[model samples]
Target chain A: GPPAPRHLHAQALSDSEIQLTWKHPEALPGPISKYVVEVQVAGDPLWIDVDRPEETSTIIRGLNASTRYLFRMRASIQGLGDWSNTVEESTLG
Target chain B: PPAPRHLHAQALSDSEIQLTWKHPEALPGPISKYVVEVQVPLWIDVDRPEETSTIIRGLNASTRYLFRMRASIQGLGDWSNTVEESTL
Candidate 1:
C-alpha cells in the first residue's frame, strides 16, 4: 500500500516563460515511461534538468528580467518505480 | 555629480517594515548622514541608525533578517562602506 501521487500544478506565461502540469494518481507498477524537469534561478547552484516524455505538460525557457524562478518534477518507471513527488514553481515580472 | 546611494533591503510585510535608499551618487553637496543596520537571529546586533531613508512605524516580525547600509556627505566625516544583506 504505497502509491500516492497527488495533483501538482503550476502556471506563469509571460516575462520569459513558464507552464507546467502534473498528475499521477495511480500508475507505477509496470511500464510507466519518462518525465523529468528541473530548474533553478535565483543565485543558482544546481538543478537544471529538462526533458519530458510521459507528457503531462511542460514549457520553460530562458528568463531573466525581474528574476525569480524555481521548479521541480520527476516521474520515471523503466527499471521499476520510484521518482515522483517534486512539483514547485515561481516566476514573475 | 551627487548620486550614488543605492543601498537596498526587502521584506515589507510580515509585521510592517519598509526601507528604501537613494542618492543617485552624491557629489554635489546636500547629504549630511544616513545609516541603516538590521540584524536578527544571525549574530545578535540590532542596529537601526538613520539620518534619512524613511523609517516610519515600528518593526519586529518574528525575527530572521539582516541588512546594512551607510552614507554621509557634505564635507564627508567618514562613513560609507557597509552593504551587507540577508533574509530567511
Candidate 2:
C-alpha cells in the first residue's frame, strides 16, 4: 500500500492573492515533475485550475479586494506518481 | 465629468451579505439615495433592493449569488453603471 501523502500548507498575501506551498515527501522515486493548483472563490461553483510546473508556490490574483478565496494543491510525477491530498486555505482582505 | 468608481459585494455567511464601494469625488448636486440589486440562483429577477451602506439578510445558503448597485442624486444624475459581482 502507498503512503497517504498530503500537500499541506498555504498562505494569503496583502496584494489580494493566495499563495500556497506544499511538500511532496512521497514523490515517486523518479525525476521531479509538475504540479497543479486549483482555487474556488468561497461560494463559487467550480474549481478554476491554476497549473504551473516550475514552482511549488502559486499566487492567485485579480480578486475582489475584500473577498475570501478557497484553494487547494496537488503534485504530479511524469508517469508513476500519485496526487497528494488537497490542502485548503482562505485568503484575506 | 463622469465619476470613476467601483463597488463589490460578498457573502459573510449563508444568510448575510455585505457591500462596499469607492467614489473619488462626490457627485454634483445633493446625493439622494443608493440602490443595491441582488440576484440569487432561485430568483427570477434582482428581487432585493437596498439603500444605506447595503446589507441583506435571509439569503439562501445553497444558491449562487450576484449583486449590482447604483446611486441616485436629487437632480439630473443617472444611476451609476451597475457593478456586477457574485458569490457561491
Candidate 3:
C-alpha cells in the first residue's frame, strides 16, 4: 500500500488557475492508477469531482479570484492510500 | 573508476528537477544504473540508466536542494561531486 500524498499545497499560478503540487508516497507497492481531485467552494456542502490525472501534480483552472476553494486528492487504487488532508486557499484577487 | 563529471541541474518546473552527468568509465562489467541523489534534507535516490540527464518531478516548491551523483557499473564503483540546485 502506498502512503497517502503529503504536503499538498496550492499556489496561485495563472490569474484564474492554481497549481496544486504534492509528494508521492516515499515508496510504492505497485503503480498507482490515477489521482482523484476534488474542489469545494466555500459554503458548498458537496464537492465537485474535478480531473483525474495520472501524474502527481496537476493544474486546476477556471476558478475565480478572491474566492476560497478547498482541494483534496487521493493516490487512487484499490485498498491503498487515503485522501490527503484538505488545503483551503484563496485565489489571489 | 570514471568519476561523474559536469554534474548539473536544470529547473523544469516548480516540482520537477532535471540533472545531467557524464558516463562512468569502467573496465569490465555492466553498468546497471546511475544513481542521482538529492540531499535537500536527506538522501533521496533517483536511479536510472545510460541516460545522462533525468527529470524528477513532484518535489516541494520554493526550496533549495543539494544534488550529487554516483554510478555502479562494469565492476561496480564511482561516486560524488556536489553541484547544487533548487526545487521551484
Candidate 4:
C-alpha cells in the first residue's frame, strides 16, 4: 500500500454541501484506481463512504445546515491504503 | 473526545434563550471553537475558546426548542447531550 494522501482539506460551500480535496500519495504501489472519501457527522459513530472519485476533489451534498462533519480519504491501488489526516469543517447556517 | 458538559438553557424572554456549558475535561488539542445547534436547524459558532455561554435570539415565542453543542479542538467532537426549553 502507498503512503497516505497529503494535504487533505474540506470546506463548506453551502448549508447543505461541502468540498473536499487532497493531494495524491507521493509513492504509488501501482496505478491508482479510485480515491475513497468517507464522512461522519459530528455526533455519529459511523463513517460513511460519501464518494469514490478518480479525481482528487469532490463535492459532497445534502448535509444538514450548520452541521460539522469529519472527512478522511485514501488512495486505492490494489486496495485502499492508509488514510490521510482527517479534516473537519462546518456548513453555513 | 468528550462533548461539552452540563448544558443549561434558560429563557430570558419570549424570543431569547441564554445557554451555558462546561468544557470537556479531556481534549485532544487546544480548543479552537464551539458549535451550537438549534432545532431551527441553525448552527452558531462561538469562536472564543474560553467562553462557555451564548445567547440565542429571534426564536419564536411560546415555542419549545432543542439545543445541542460540541467543541472543536483538532477536529469536531461529539455533541453534548441536548437541552430542551420553551420560550416565555
Residue B33 in model 4: lDDT: 62
Off by over 4 Å in 4: A1-93, B74-88
| lDDT tens readout by residue for model 1, A2-68 | 1323455556666666676666646445544445555566463443333454567776666544556
Order of candidates by lDDT, top first? Answer: 4, 3, 2, 1
Error of 2 at B6 (Å): 55
Chain A alone, TM-score per model: 0.28, 0.53, 0.64, 0.69
Q: TM-score winner among the candidates?
A: 4
Global Cα RMSD, each model: 22.9, 23.5, 19.7, 18.6
Q: Write the per-residue lDDT of candidate 3 for residues A1-93, one digit (tens) a residue.
A: 444567677776765776677766666666654555566564744333323534557777677766666676565442211111221211111
Q: Model 1 captures what fraction of native contacts?
A: 0.00
Q: Global lDDT of each model?
A: 0.43, 0.43, 0.52, 0.59
* Candidate 3 vs candidate 4, lDDT winner: 4
lDDT of 3 by residue, B1-88 (tens): 3446667676665667776666655434444455555544343444455577777665766666667665543221111111111122
Model 3 docking category:
incorrect
TM-score of each model, in listed order = 0.19, 0.33, 0.37, 0.42
- Model 1: lDDT equals 0.43
Indicate the TM-score of model 1.
0.19
Q: List the residue pairs that clash in candidate 4.
A: none
What does DockQ give for each predicted structure?
0.01, 0.01, 0.01, 0.02
Model 2 misplacement above 4 A:
A1-7, A27-29, A44-54, A78-93, B1-88
